[PDB]
Amino acid sequence: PRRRVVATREILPDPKFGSQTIAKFINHVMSHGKKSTAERIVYGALETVAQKRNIEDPVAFFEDVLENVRPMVEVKARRVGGATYQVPMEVRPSRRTALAMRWLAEAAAKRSEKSMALRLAGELSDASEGKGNAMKKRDEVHRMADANKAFS
Amino acid sequence: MNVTIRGHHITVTEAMNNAVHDKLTKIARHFDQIQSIQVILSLDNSGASDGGQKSHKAEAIMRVSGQEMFVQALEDDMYKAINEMADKLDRQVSKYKTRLERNKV
Amino acid sequence: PAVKVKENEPVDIAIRRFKRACEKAGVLSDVRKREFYEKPTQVRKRKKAAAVKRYKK
Amino acid sequence: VSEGIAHIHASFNNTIVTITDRQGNALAWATSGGQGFRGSRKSTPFAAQVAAEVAGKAAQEYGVKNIDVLVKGPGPGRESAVRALGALGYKVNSISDVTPIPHNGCRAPKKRRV
RNA sequence: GAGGAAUACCGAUGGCGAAGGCAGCCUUCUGGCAUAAUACUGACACUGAGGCUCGAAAGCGUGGGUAGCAAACAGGAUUAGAUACCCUGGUAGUCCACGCCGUAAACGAUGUCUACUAGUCGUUGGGUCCGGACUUAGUGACGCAGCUAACGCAAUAAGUAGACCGCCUGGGGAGUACGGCCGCAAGGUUAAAACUCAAAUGAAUUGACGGGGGCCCGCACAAGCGGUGGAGCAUGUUGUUUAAU
Numbered sequence: 018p019r020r021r022v023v024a025t026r027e028i029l030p031d032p033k034f035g036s037q038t039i040a041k042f043i044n045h046v047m048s049h050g051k052k053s054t055a056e057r058i059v060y061g062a063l064e065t066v067a068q069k070r071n072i073e074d075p076v077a078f079f080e081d082v083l084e085n086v087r088p089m090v091e092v093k094a095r096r097v098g099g100a101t102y103q104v105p106m107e108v109r110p111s112r113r114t115a116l117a118m119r120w121l122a123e124a125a126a127k128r129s130e131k132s133m134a135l136r137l138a139g140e141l142s143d144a145s146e147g148k149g150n151a152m153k154k155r156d157e158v159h160r161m162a163d164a165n166k167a168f169s
Numbered sequence: 170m171n172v173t174i175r176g177h178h179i180t181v182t183e184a185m186n187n188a189v190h191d192k193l194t195k196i197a198r199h200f201d202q203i204q205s206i207q208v209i210l211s212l213d214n215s216g217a218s219d220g221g222q223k224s225h226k227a228e229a230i231m232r233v234s235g236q237e238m239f240v241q242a243l244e245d246d247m248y249k250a251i252n253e254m255a256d257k258l259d260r261q262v263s264k265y266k267t268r269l270e271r272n273k274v
Numbered sequence: 275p276a277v278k279v280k281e282n283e284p285v286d287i288a289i290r291r292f293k294r295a296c297e298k299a300g301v302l303s304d305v306r307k308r309e310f311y312e313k314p315t316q317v318r319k320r321k322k323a324a325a326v327k328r329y330k331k
Numbered sequence: 332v333s334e335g336i337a338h339i340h341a342s343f344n345n346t347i348v349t350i351t352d353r354q355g356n357a358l359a360w361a362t363s364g365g366q367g368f369r370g371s372r373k374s375t376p377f378a379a380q381v382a383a384e385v386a387g388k389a390a391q392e393y394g395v396k397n398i399d400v401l402v403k404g405p406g407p408g409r410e411s412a413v414r415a416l417g418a419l420g421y422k423v424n425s426i427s428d429v430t431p432i433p434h435n436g437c438r439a440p441k442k443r444r445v
Numbered sequence: 446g447a448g449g450a451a452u453a454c455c456g457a458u459g460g461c462g463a464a465g466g467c468a469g470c471c472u473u474c475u476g477g478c479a480u481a482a483u484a485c486u487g488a489c490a491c492u493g494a495g496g497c498u499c500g501a502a503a504g505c506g507u508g509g510g511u512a513g514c515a516a517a518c519a520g521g522a523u524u525a526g527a528u529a530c531c532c533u534g535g536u537a538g539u540c541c542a543c544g545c546c547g548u549a550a551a552c553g554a555u556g557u558c559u560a561c562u563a564g565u566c567g568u569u570g571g572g573u574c575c576g577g578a579c580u581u582a583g584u585g586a587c588g589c590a591g592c593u594a595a596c597g598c599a600a601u602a603a604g605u606a607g608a609c610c611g612c613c614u615g616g617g618g619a620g621u622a623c624g625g626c627c628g629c630a631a632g633g634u635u636a637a638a639a640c641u642c643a644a645a646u647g648a649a650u651u652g653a654c655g656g657g658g659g660c661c662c663g664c665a666c667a668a669g670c671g672g673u674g675g676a677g678c679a680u681g682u683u684g685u686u687u688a689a690u
Contacts, residue, residue, distance in 0.1 A: 019661085019663090048671095167377040173683080201525075266524095270524070272656085274523095276425055279426055289410050289414060292426040292428070304454090305430060308432075308439050309439065310441060311439040325457080330586085433451085433452090433453070434452060434453040436450075436512095437512070439514080441515075444531085445530075
């Protein structure tokens with residue numbers, strides 16, 4: 018805002034795993050302020066993947082898929098002499114996680130499973146192995162970032 | 170591209186509608202990127218201390234993709250107001266079109 | 275503008291030396307002078323403006 | 332052929348790097364317009380970098396190891412090409428700039444009225 | 446290998462020339478200038494209507510030459526169109542010889558020649574003294590007095606005066622017509638009137654504006670979340686309809 022670096026708010030960890038990453042994902046899924054609702058979908062999907070894969074640490078599994086999902090290079094719209102060529106830069110660490118979470122939620126929003134918990138569980142399972150629309154979008158971002166690879 | 174022709178405090182006639190439509194389609198011939206046109210023909214005063222000379226008004230609010238240009242013209246006669254409004258609108262269309270075309274180089 | 279890169283010398287520092295020698299020879303200014311034809315009246319105008327600027331320091 | 336000369340004909344639009352032998356017999360050549368870069372990307376130091384890699388590695392079959400580069404032109408890709416050639420196993424003997432300059436010879440084209 | 450043209454660097458509010466102009470290097474022919482001293486002529490001077498000479502570029506005639514560039518021209522783009530700007534080509538011309546042409550914002554928008562009037566700092570060619578000092582002919586940047594509507598000029602005056610010559614007398618019509626003269630031509634030069642309008646101008650001031658510059662701000666954009674625009678209904682307006690809406 019052509020001004021100072023306004024300080025970011027303090028997120029409160031979710032009650033179950035006590036992880037700020039899961040709290041941030043809960044906020045991402047939540048709409049209309051229904052935090053309890055989003056908590057219940059996020060917990061249902063995480064429990065479903067934990068049971069299906071028989072993994073003791075759902076938060077560690079989620080951290081693994083999140084780190085596997087978040088990109089490394091993005092493309093921005095620069096301007097030199099009224100020209101629009103896309104410049105590949107390195108995503109800032111704060112933006113990496115937000116982009117990954119938003120991609121996961123928006124990819125799980127268009128699955129064929131009955132409930133959003135099931136859709137999110139399926140998307141998490143696919144992203145843990147490197148499939149799904151989240152990986153598709155991340156690879157489509159890397160495709161542009163490497164197919165420019167000439168504007169700094 | 171829309172064309173609305175409203176009339177405030179005056180009864181817009183078929184002749185007024187033609188006299189605005191013919192010039193609107195003339196500007197829309199050279200510029201094909203117009204989204205909407207709204208022309209208000211008004212009688213904003215009675216000329217009680219100046220004897221007309223600005224008694225009729227013709228204003229055109231046109232909207233293009235990413236910009237909105239408004240012009241107005243006061244005159245004693247509504248047809249002359251319409252023509253002066255149309256000329257200002259044509260000049261502004263030409264100005265925007267040439268700026269956009271010269272932004273590429 | 276030839277730079278003879280020596281043994282055990284990185285290509286990076288050798289190219290920095292080559293850039294320094296090309297500036298020393300003023301090669302790219304010579305190339306830029308012939309991009310287009312500059313009319314003698316424009317040449318004299320440019321040189322007199324440069325002379326005024328040089329003398330005002 | 333062990334000993335060779337790189338010729339980086341850099342230009343504002345395109346950069347052409349060709350490796351020949353001492354007597355100016357071309358071995359391999361690669362440009363930036365024939366590497367997947369067209370228009371705006373062709374006039375970029377990275378395009379000259381990949382053209383230099385393609386040409387140098389394609390001339391390494393002949394067995395050239397010691398190369399002296401000859402840069403010619405004002406193009407952006409006249410240092411990145413040398414860097415790509417050098418950091419590909421080549422041994423740079425010298426880096427000479429040989430772009431032609433007229434001693435007030437032929438008349439230049441008219442100034443662009445953009 | 447052929448050919449034509451131009452002469453990078455040096456290069457410089459540098460130099461030379463009456464201006465126009467004149468850049469690789471060498472020779473031949475040749476003009477002016479600057480400088481020291483002595484000797485000499487003894488007013489031989491200044492300016493100058495007409496006249497003559499010279500006079501960029503483009504252009505013209507004849508005969509050559511012809512690389513690059515490039516009017517015209519051809520095509521491709523851009524665009525509503527694009528007889529343009531941009532791109533690819535391209536002939537005249539540009540170059541040479543000999544003749545025309547006689548015009549340019551041919552400008553310092555400042556006629557020539559004299560004398561006199563604070564100063565300061567550069568620079569080019571000399572000269573004389575003790576690395577400096579003085580002096581000369583230029584060529585620049587400042588800056589008093591003075592002048593100027595103001596801008597500004599200010600020993601290279603637009604100051605103070607003098608000699609002679611040229612020119613102006615509102616803006617258009619019009620540097621046009623007609624008539625001469627010149628020119629191969631293009632055209633030049635000399636040069637009106639009727640009519641028309643009450644302004645047209647210069648410098649400067651305050652704004653406003655700029656596809657001028659610099660700096661900054663606002664959910665202005667960017668980064669996001671949610672909508673409007675599609676459906677049905679509520680509501681207001683246009684329009685239409687009505688006796689009135």
